[PDB]
Amino acid sequence: QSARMVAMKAATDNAGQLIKDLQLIYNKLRQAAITQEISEIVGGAAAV
Amino acid sequence: SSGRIIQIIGAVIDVEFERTSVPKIYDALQVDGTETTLEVQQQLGDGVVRTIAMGSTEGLKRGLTVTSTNAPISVPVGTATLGRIMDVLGRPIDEAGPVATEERLPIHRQAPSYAEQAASTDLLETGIKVIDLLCPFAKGGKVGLFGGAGVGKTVNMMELINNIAKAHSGLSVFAGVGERTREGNDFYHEMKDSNVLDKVAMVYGQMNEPPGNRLRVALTGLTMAEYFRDEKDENGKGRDVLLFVDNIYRYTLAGTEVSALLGRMPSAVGYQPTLAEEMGVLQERITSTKSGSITSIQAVYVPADDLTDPSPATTFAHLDATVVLSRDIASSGIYPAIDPLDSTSRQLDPLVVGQEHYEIARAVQNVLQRYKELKDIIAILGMDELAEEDKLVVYRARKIQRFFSQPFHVAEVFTGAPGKLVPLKETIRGFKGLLAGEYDHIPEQAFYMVGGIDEVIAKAEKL
Amino acid sequence: MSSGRIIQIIGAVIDVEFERTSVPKIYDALQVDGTETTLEVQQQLGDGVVRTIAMGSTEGLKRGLTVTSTNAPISVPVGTATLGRIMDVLGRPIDEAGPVATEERLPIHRQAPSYAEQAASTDLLETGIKVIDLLCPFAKGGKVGLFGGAGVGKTVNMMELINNIAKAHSGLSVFAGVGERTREGNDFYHEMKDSNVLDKVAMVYGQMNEPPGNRLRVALTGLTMAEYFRDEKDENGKGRDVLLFVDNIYRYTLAGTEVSALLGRMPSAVGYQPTLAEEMGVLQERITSTKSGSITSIQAVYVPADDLTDPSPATTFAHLDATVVLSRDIASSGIYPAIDPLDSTSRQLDPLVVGQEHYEIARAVQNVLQRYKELKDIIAILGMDELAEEDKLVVYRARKIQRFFSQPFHVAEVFTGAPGKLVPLKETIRGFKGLLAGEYDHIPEQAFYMVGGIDEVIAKAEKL
Amino acid sequence: PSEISALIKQRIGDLDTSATAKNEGTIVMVSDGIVRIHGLADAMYGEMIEFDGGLFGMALNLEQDSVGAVVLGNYLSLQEGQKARCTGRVLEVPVGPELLGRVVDALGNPIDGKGPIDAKLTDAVEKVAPGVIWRQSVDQPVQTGYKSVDTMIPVGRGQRELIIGDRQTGKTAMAIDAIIAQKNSGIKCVYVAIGQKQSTIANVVRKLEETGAMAYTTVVAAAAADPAAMQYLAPYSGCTMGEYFRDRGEDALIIYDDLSKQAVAYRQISLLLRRPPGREAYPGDVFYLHSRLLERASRVSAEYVEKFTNGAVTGKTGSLTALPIIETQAGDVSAFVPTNVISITDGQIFLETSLFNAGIRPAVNAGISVSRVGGSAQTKIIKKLSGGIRTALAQYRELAAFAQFASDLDEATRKQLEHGQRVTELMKQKQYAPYSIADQAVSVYASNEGYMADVEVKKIVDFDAALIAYFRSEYAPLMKQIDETGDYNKDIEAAIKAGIESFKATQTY
Numbered sequence A: 001q002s003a004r005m006v007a008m009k010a011a012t013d014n015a016g017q018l019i020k021d022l023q024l025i026y027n028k029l030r031q032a033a034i035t036q037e038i039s040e041i042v043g044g045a046a047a048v
Numbered sequence B: 001s002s003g004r005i006i007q008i009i010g011a012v013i014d015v016e017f018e019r020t021s022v023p024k025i026y027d028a029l030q031v032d033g034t035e036t037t038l039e040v041q042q043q044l045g046d047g048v049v050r051t052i053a054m055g056s057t058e059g060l061k062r063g064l065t066v067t068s069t070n071a072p073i074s075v076p077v078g079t080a081t082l083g084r085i086m087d088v089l090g091r092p093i094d095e096a097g098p099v100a101t102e103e104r105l106p107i108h109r110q111a112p113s114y115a116e117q118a119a120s121t122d123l124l125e126t127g128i129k130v131i132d133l134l135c136p137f138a139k140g141g142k143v144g145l146f147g148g149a150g151v152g153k154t155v156n157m158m159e160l161i162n163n164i165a166k167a168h169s170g171l172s173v174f175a176g177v178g179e180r181t182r183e184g185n186d187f188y189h190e191m192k193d194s195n196v197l198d199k200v201a202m203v204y205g206q207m208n209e210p211p212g213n214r215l216r217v218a219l220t221g222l223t224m225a226e227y228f229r230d231e232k233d234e235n236g237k238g239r240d241v242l243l244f245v246d247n248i249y250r251y252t253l254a255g256t257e258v259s260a261l262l263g264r265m266p267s268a269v270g271y272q273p274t275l276a277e278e279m280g281v282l283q284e285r286i287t288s289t290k291s292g293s294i295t296s297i298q299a300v301y302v303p304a305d306d307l308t309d310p311s312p313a314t315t316f317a318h319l320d321a322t323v324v325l326s327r328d329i330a331s332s333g334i335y336p337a338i339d340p341l342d343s344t345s346r347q348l349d350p351l352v353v354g355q356e357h358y359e360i361a362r363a364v365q366n367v368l369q370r371y372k373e374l375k376d377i378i379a380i381l382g383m384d385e386l387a388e389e390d391k392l393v394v395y396r397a398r399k400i401q402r403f404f405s406q407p408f409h410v411a412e413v414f415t416g417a418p419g420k421l422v423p424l425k426e427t428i429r430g431f432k433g434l435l436a437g438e439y440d441h442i443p444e445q446a447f448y449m450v451g452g453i454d455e456v457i458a459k460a461e462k463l
Numbered sequence C: 001m002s003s004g005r006i007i008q009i010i011g012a013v014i015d016v017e018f019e020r021t022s023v024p025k026i027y028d029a030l031q032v033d034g035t036e037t038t039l040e041v042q043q044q045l046g047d048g049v050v051r052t053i054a055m056g057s058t059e060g061l062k063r064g065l066t067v068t069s070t071n072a073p074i075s076v077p078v079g080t081a082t083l084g085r086i087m088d089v090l091g092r093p094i095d096e097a098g099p100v101a102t103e104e105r106l107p108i109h110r111q112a113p114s115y116a117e118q119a120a121s122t123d124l125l126e127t128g129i130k131v132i133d134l135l136c137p138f139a140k141g142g143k144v145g146l147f148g149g150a151g152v153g154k155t156v157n158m159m160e161l162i163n164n165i166a167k168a169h170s171g172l173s174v175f176a177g178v179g180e181r182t183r184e185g186n187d188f189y190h191e192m193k194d195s196n197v198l199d200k201v202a203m204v205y206g207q208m209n210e211p212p213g214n215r216l217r218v219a220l221t222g223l224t225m226a227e228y229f230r231d232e233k234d235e236n237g238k239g240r241d242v243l244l245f246v247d248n249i250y251r252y253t254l255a256g257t258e259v260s261a262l263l264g265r266m267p268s269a270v271g272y273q274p275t276l277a278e279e280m281g282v283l284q285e286r287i288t289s290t291k292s293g294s295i296t297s298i299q300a301v302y303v304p305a306d307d308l309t310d311p312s313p314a315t316t317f318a319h320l321d322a323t324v325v326l327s328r329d330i331a332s333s334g335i336y337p338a339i340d341p342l343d344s345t346s347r348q349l350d351p352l353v354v355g356q357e358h359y360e361i362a363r364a365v366q367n368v369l370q371r372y373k374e375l376k377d378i379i380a381i382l383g384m385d386e387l388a389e390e391d392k393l394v395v396y397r398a399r400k401i402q403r404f405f406s407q408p409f410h411v412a413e414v415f416t417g418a419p420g421k422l423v424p425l426k427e428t429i430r431g432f433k434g435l436l437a438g439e440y441d442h443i444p445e446q447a448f449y450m451v452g453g454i455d456e457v458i459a460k461a462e463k464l
Numbered sequence D: 001p002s003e004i005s006a007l008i009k010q011r012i013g014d015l016d017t018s019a020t021a022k023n024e025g026t027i028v029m030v031s032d033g034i035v036r037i038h039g040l041a042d043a044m045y046g047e048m049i050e051f052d053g054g055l056f057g058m059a060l061n062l063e064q065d066s067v068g069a070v071v072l073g074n075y076l077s078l079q080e081g082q083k084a085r086c087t088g089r090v091l092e093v094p095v096g097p098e099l100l101g102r103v104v105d106a107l108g109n110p111i112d113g114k115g116p117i118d119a120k121l122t123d124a125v126e127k128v129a130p131g132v133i134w135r136q137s138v139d140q141p142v143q144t145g146y147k148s149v150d151t152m153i154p155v156g157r158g159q160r161e162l163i164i165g166d167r168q169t170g171k172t173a174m175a176i177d178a179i180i181a182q183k184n185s186g187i188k189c190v191y192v193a194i195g196q197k198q199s200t201i202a203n204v205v206r207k208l209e210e211t212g213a214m215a216y217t218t219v220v221a222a223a224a225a226d227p228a229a230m231q232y233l234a235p236y237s238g239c240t241m242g243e244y245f246r247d248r249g250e251d252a253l254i255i256y257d258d259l260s261k262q263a264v265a266y267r268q269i270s271l272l273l274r275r276p277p278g279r280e281a282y283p284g285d286v287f288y289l290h291s292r293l294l295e296r297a298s299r300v301s302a303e304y305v306e307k308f309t310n311g312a313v314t315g316k317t318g319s320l321t322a323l324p325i326i327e328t329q330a331g332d333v334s335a336f337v338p339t340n341v342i343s344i345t346d347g348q349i350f351l352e353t354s355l356f357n358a359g360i361r362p363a364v365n366a367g368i369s370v371s372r373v374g375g376s377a378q379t380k381i382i383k384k385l386s387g388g389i390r391t392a393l394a395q396y397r398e399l400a401a402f403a404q405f406a407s408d409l410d411e412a413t414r415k416q417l418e419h420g421q422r423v424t425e426l427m428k429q430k431q432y433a434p435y436s437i438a439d440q441a442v443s444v445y446a447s448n449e450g451y452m453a454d455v456e457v458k459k460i461v462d463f464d465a466a467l468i469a470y471f472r473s474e475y476a477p478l479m480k481q482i483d484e485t486g487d488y489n490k491d492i493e494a495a496i497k498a499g500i501e502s503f504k505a506t507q508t509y
Ligand SMILES: Nc1ncnc2c1ncn2[C@@H]1O[C@H](COP(=O)(O)OP(=O)(O)OP(=O)(O)O)[C@@H](O)[C@H]1O
Pocket: B317, B346, B349, D166, D167, D168, D169, D170, D171, D172, D173, D174, D327, D361, D362, D429, D430, D431
């Protein structure tokens, strides 16, 4: 019982760490997507 | 006072006219060399116009004279088109000789007015288990078919065609919109061997023609359906007609193609800003009226199974049901192979369907979705370690899946082409009994590939 | 002869022509002849052609209509009477209580403060709130990052700040509503009025019912107000040191993006104006102290999309000096204010700034509060009495700390009775140090709650 | 018979009284309801324009040599050479209490087939919000018949509150049901529909008529088959009609539909004007566009009322509550348009797809939906009784994970879990079944009294309905008095508890 308890605690901690990781990468990707699309739009508008 | 070819770039065409004589929008322009025709898109002043080529894009010479008709695009309509396949221009493409009628009508009428909406919602039944229980239809409705590539979707539409034809003198009509012409020919011949073409009219846009043609096939089919509905027969009310869209997405893409070359700026995805305008123009001319109604079926394609972008988003704001086909249920050997858990309709309402049918649908949703989420743990341990509770649930879910297996009326060769078209009430009875457990003592196989309780019991007794 | 006539109108941008011998400079002020709308020179288009923006609605207007200039940037009233008065960006009263009393007018723009005037010292503002006073001391002429949602007493904290600065340091208060919603603005007014503090503050709002230029320039408006008050010298020189309240600078950046887009200029990485940093700075450098007087800033900050790496907050942090964050749970725990005493960061947190002992004390408090925070989960799950008794002592002491950091407010006096208590350092410091010594481990946590200095705490404890 | 003949003749002799010296323009360029015209040197900004075909147009771009204007009616009837003409006026639409029971165009033109409308008054669509000095606080509540809504998310007369969520989430139903609850409020209501299937529109119409509430109600719809400009301007017109009564000292409610959609239309229009695009093609002023609309609705200081009436009315204060709706893509909040919207409202409400998919009807997620106006928008009794729900729902939502758990956990956790599960289920509700505040009151009392903390969860709704009917019959004067006032008193609660314990003692559920 003790060992299972400790392992669950560690699992929770690793989950939190991975959550941080994913959140950071998500922010980066959202920024990149916005950049790409706005560049597309401005180029297309500049076409005329 | 004839215009001339002044500039051509790909799909966009321009013509000079005498400033006094100026064509109006949406009127046909006659190439004085070839049969090819031009539609006005916008007036460029000074007698200059912008147009799109209806037909081939060959044989074109800067400075070739072109004339007009000073009138919108009108094509023949009437019973003299049934069982015939026409081009975007309404010409015989089936080599069955010219059309017989001269009843020609334009294609850009306005949407039906507000005051003339059918003052009451209606319902349509198909005699099909999963649909008439979980995907109800309103006569005049809007239906979407998403995905499905391991099964014959055209088989499903043709089944619905036989459904409506035997169900009503209300004829049917299909329009080829970016048609995978292999499947189109297959459908043509299979309807042919069905001997059912008298209630069918055919126009094809088959991924080989300037984008305008594939744009406008939709309008053609719309016009045919409109007029055919408007033929008030012996009573003052014509038949309620059915439409088949080869793909709405290709209708969107047709305008999407040359929008930028039109001088249109791109949209949020780079699309055409007039997307919603044309979409509504299309849909609002598809309704139920005070006298008669028109409904349609739309074969839907989804890009990368992604719905979270405008191209399906706009469509969804006009449908009434989202029939999403299922592949692995087909792998389960199910004939219809339609998902029972994702497909919905806005028509699922007790006030319109009654209470009992609605609540039966509720219960079956609950049991199926609960059975799904236990799959993992069942795999991990087995049925035994689960409480005795939900064992009957598993059995009932399996029997439900079997009950959904509906032999097709018209395949001509899948199980003998047997029709079921079971009444909604009988299926209600059967599913009510199954939910209660009236027959939760029989192997699910007895519920497989059959219809009502009579067939299930007879099968269980014969084995 | 400065009358020029409208030549072209789109949306909010406005174009006029003038004589090629008399051309207004950029940022000059144009009053439309016969109407109360005003035009702002943006870029000289040559040929006596100028492209400008309007200040308000643009309706009914028609081309060829004459417009004069002022040959100068925008000037607004400034003076002592400006308190208790709500004006537009143009410094024109909207309280509808008569015109502005002063005849003193100053142009909105001026260059950045001289390098020579940057004071060769850096010291700390005294406040009596007992929390920032230890953990995140403010510099003199600093920028304080503030975060957290509404309903946690933001207005209340501002109330207390104003009260203290005006009371002890005789500070004057200026508030700028960038992109304000009218209802909360009016509520804030009524609060200014009931709590007898309105007479000491100068108020200007820009609503989100106005074209962007209004919202952009209310900032510089309030800034200049503050500049005038500070540079207004006192007896024997040494003009006051003042505090500036500005809402949602992020809205400011957004309005800058607005006007840049309307000019038809390409976006930035995310899509802000490419010049973003320019206006950000131009705002910043006029926020500082001088050899005469000082200015300090409180700025409401909102982080859209929670991106600490977004360009706008990134540029913000380039000038931030202290960070204060507001909690929801802490307030729900009946502790006011709900300042998280664990995320607030101060550039001034150095033994070279607050002194050696003060620095070490604060670090020790931080350690204790951390230590208890990771204790919390174990206390919850595995009980309490399964740990080191020293850890339990830590628990009690940290609880006393948290109970103590909240205090009555002199603004809270009118709210719920209970007159507030002003407290400086050198008593907070001593009391906290003694608490760290554990010499008060014989007293319930209650004596620390809703109370002033440690002497008061012991008075209550004896009386409890 | 001969009557009209005299009528037409007498009318005719009233005309051609002189020759006009008007200034007008002519057509140079046409594309998709957008026209470049030449001439008309003098022109009001945003002047409404007339054309030889009887149609009308809206002038936006006053360039130095020409004019761009958008078709208001239906183009595909205009050709270069035809002559425009300004009206010497700005866009204006009619208002008036006679508009009740009437359905019109975004221009204010009947579509109900009920003939002309005798509006004595018309007004310019575009105006400005009153002076912030003419704002006084919000204290009168607005009822929704939704216990969760009316408890955790109070709504006061003149407040801007946002319903938001993903698609097919009953948002339309939420708005209309909120409308229904106005049998007794005495306020009037306006529904604004944007880009909708006339079928849906007519269904809503018919349903409302069944409720009969289309008598203190007016509605306009910019369906999907309408000129984009019509759609773009329509919400402003609705705001105009609302402001009519607001400035009459009256209190009312209005509802938008798909402000996102009209934003799309405006995007398209601006784009066709060759204006500089912004992010996602959105001209920046979209923020300005929406904001200049929303703030026009509020609760005003009665002093403003009095001075506007010039003495006509002196007692009441006008108000107007704003209930807009935004549809979202996969529940994002970071999209530019919603992001703009958020900082504008006084409070927001989310809809979660899973809950309705889980059959949670309604599917509101109270976990993030807030109303920063506080209890000031509740009645005293509800203001009193909300806290129990508040805290119970809190505790549940932190620790709801234990559903299958708590076979070994401490008992207090189990009891609190049962409490939470029951109260969570309590809010499941059907459309067109508004709860009077008395009904909500008895439900909350039974909740906090724990008299439902002893009954199975599956029949909680049945329990509630039975209780409802029981009081409704037995103790009608009590609820009468309650909803007359909405005050919490020891006598009142004692009567309520006596009735409850009687019900438990009496007929079972
Ligand atoms: N509490 C309820 N009980 C029973 N049915 C309900 C309930 N709430 C909503 N519905 C049903 O759900 C259906 C769909 O809701 P609705 O059409 O209002 O979603 P929507 O978001 O407005 O759709 P769209 O996004 O297309 O505008 C309605 O037809 C309504 O009958």
